[PDB]
Homo-oligomer: A and B are copies of this chain.
Amino acid sequence: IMQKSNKINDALNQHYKLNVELGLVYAHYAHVADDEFDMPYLGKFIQHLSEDKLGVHKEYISDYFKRNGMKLKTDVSVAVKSIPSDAKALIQEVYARENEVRDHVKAIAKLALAEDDYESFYFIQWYVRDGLKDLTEVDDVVKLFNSSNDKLIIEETIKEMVE
């Protein structure tokens, strides 16, 4: 009498895929921030976000599926074929992707209510809140590039954020 929603199943499989692929992209951007742009703390901030997407962001869905009978799907393809031209544009790109996360998460909450899937509406509340948190942390680094022209000042300020 509690059959899982296929629509929610698909939307969460899509979101699983987004977090894997985002995490793989951020792992690359973390590398570039350190190696090419000489900003290892910016690299550490982005690497932390990468391990976040490839960790709890995907594991919570996988665990959730175990409990309710939804089917997990692993279908992944991502190629980092060009890189932003400097550190500001790099973190600006990360921002734009985190903003899209908020839009994807919102669609899932809306769908969960349309499906009368209150377990799924409960489960997604965490993503609803974290969408704004991850976006805010990234926004706190974007602001640094408009507040100083000095890479090492910026780096020094980031070091108190991923501490």
Contacts and interface: CB of A to CB of B under 8 A. Distances in A.
A144 interface: yes
A157 B122 CA distance: 31
Interface residues of A, number: 64
B152 A38 contact: no
Give the number of copies in the complex.
Answer: 6
Nearest to A20: B24
Interface in A108-163: 109-110, 113, 116, 118-119, 122, 125, 128-129, 131-132, 135-136, 143-144, 146-157
Interface SS of A by simple majority? helix
A31 interface: yes
Ranked 6 nearest A-B pairs via Cβ: A147-B151, A74-B80, A109-B118, A148-B152, A77-B77, A28-B74
Interface of A: 1-2, 20-21, 24-25, 27-28, 31-32, 34-35, 38-39, 54, 58, 62, 65-68, 72-80, 99-100, 102-103, 105-106, 109-110, 113, 116, 118-119, 122, 125, 128-129, 131-132, 135-136, 143-144, 146-157
